[PDB]
Structures are given as C-alpha cells and as structure tokens.
Design an enzyme around this catalytic site. Structure first.
Site, mmCIF file in Angstrom:
data_model
loop_
_atom_site.group_PDB
_atom_site.id
_atom_site.type_symbol
_atom_site.label_atom_id
_atom_site.label_comp_id
_atom_site.label_asym_id
_atom_site.label_seq_id
_atom_site.Cartn_x
_atom_site.Cartn_y
_atom_site.Cartn_z
ATOM 1 C CE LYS A 7 -3.826 2.421 2.237
ATOM 2 N NZ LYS A 7 -4.543 2.447 3.826
ATOM 3 N NE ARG A 10 -3.617 0.742 -4.138
ATOM 4 C CZ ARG A 10 -4.303 1.782 -2.935
ATOM 5 N NH1 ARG A 10 -4.538 2.672 -3.937
ATOM 6 N NH2 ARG A 10 -4.071 1.309 -2.014
ATOM 7 C CG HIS A 12 3.107 7.293 -0.272
ATOM 8 N ND1 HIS A 12 2.299 7.995 -0.402
ATOM 9 C CD2 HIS A 12 3.023 6.628 0.701
ATOM 10 C CE1 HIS A 12 1.346 8.152 0.832
ATOM 11 N NE2 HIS A 12 1.989 7.264 1.563
ATOM 12 C CE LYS A 41 -3.894 9.087 1.331
ATOM 13 N NZ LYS A 41 -2.416 8.573 1.422
ATOM 14 N N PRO A 42 -7.715 13.272 0.004
ATOM 15 C CG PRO A 42 -8.479 14.068 2.700
ATOM 16 C CD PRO A 42 -7.685 12.755 1.542
ATOM 17 C CB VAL A 43 -2.880 15.230 1.453
ATOM 18 C CG1 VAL A 43 -3.588 17.240 1.825
ATOM 19 C CG2 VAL A 43 -2.827 14.191 2.843
ATOM 20 C CG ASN A 44 -1.024 10.289 -2.136
ATOM 21 O OD1 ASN A 44 -0.900 9.029 -0.882
ATOM 22 N ND2 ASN A 44 -0.722 9.371 -2.589
ATOM 23 C CB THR A 45 3.468 12.855 -0.872
ATOM 24 O OG1 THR A 45 3.472 13.831 -0.167
ATOM 25 C CG2 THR A 45 5.208 12.778 -1.162
ATOM 26 C CE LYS A 66 -0.523 12.078 9.954
ATOM 27 N NZ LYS A 66 -0.287 12.500 8.916
ATOM 28 N NE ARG A 85 -2.260 18.952 0.807
ATOM 29 C CZ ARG A 85 -2.139 19.537 2.469
ATOM 30 N NH1 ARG A 85 -3.412 19.885 2.923
ATOM 31 N NH2 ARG A 85 -0.816 18.391 3.415
ATOM 32 C CG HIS A 119 2.333 5.956 8.148
ATOM 33 N ND1 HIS A 119 1.367 6.882 7.763
ATOM 34 C CD2 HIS A 119 2.904 7.674 8.428
ATOM 35 C CE1 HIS A 119 0.948 8.559 7.987
ATOM 36 N NE2 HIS A 119 2.117 8.704 8.980
ATOM 37 C CG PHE A 120 4.652 10.034 2.397
ATOM 38 C CD1 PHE A 120 4.695 11.517 3.295
ATOM 39 C CD2 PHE A 120 5.839 9.105 2.286
ATOM 40 C CE1 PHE A 120 5.495 12.384 2.651
ATOM 41 C CE2 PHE A 120 7.008 10.141 1.741
ATOM 42 C CZ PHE A 120 6.472 11.659 1.688
ATOM 43 C CG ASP A 121 4.256 11.534 9.993
ATOM 44 O OD1 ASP A 121 3.595 10.495 10.936
ATOM 45 O OD2 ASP A 121 5.226 11.990 10.509
#
Length: 124
Positions: A7, A10, A12, A41-45, A66, A85, A119-121
């Site tokens: 995940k 996929r 990031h 999805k509101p925000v993703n890098t 965080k 975003r 996870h992308f923090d």
C-alpha cells in the site's frame, strides 16, 4: 487485501519519473493509483526516487511520527517529491488535485522484517 508495504508503494512510489511532468500529474496519478475510487484522498505525496533509496530511509534518522509513534524515520538527504492536494474545485467523483513539485526530506513510518515503509508521515 494489500500488505502495508504494498500500500505504501502504491500510494507513494513513482520511480518512473525524476519529477512531476505537468500540472496534471496529480490528477492522473491519484486516479491511476486507485486513490479516487471510493473517495477523493485529500492529500498524498509521490516520491521520485528508487524504491531502494526510499526503503533505505528506514535505516536513517529515527524521529517521532506526527501521532507520537517512535518508528518514523527522516531521510538524511532531500528527495524529489510531488505533493498532491485536493483543491476547492474538487468534488467526488470529479476529484481535482493541485500538483506541487518539491525537493525535500521525507518522513516515513517503518514496520516488519524486512523493515520497510508502511506510512508516509510528512515531508520537510
């Protein structure tokens, strides 16, 4: 279905480009990585580095996530990334994203054996 590792990959990883090609990069990538299927999805890098280089961050600077988890890691060096975003004109199922190209440190949470990003923090 889907391991945390897969995940992360996929959501990031984009090692196929050195940087976002156009202002439409996020609209295309958010759709094609299935991040607009049931929701915008509101925000993703996305990270424009090799998978090996991003995995290597799990062995770099141990930092707090965080939410206060202790298994986050900051890349020693900056990386080519694209921040995606959701904008004011966005309304599911017509998702609309702002594309923001940048070069900076990434922060990921890592888990497992092999110890990999799950996870992308943040970026800094």
């Amino acid at each position: 279905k889907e391991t945390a590792a897969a995940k992360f990959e996929r959501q990031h990883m984009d090692s196929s480009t050195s940087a976002a090609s156009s202002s439409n990069y996020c609209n295309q990538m958010m759709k094609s990585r299935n991040l607009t299927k049931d929701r915008c999805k509101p925000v993703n890098t996305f990270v424009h580095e090799s998978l090996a280089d991003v995995q290597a961050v799990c062995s770099q600077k141990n930092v707090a996530c965080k939410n206060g988890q202790t298994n986050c890691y900051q890349s020693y060096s900056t990386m080519s990334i694209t921040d995606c975003r959701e904008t004011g004109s966005s309304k599911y199922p017509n998702c609309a994203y702002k594309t923001t190209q940048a070069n900076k440190h990434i922060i990921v949470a890592c888990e497992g054996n092999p110890y990999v990003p799950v996870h992308f923090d943040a970026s800094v």
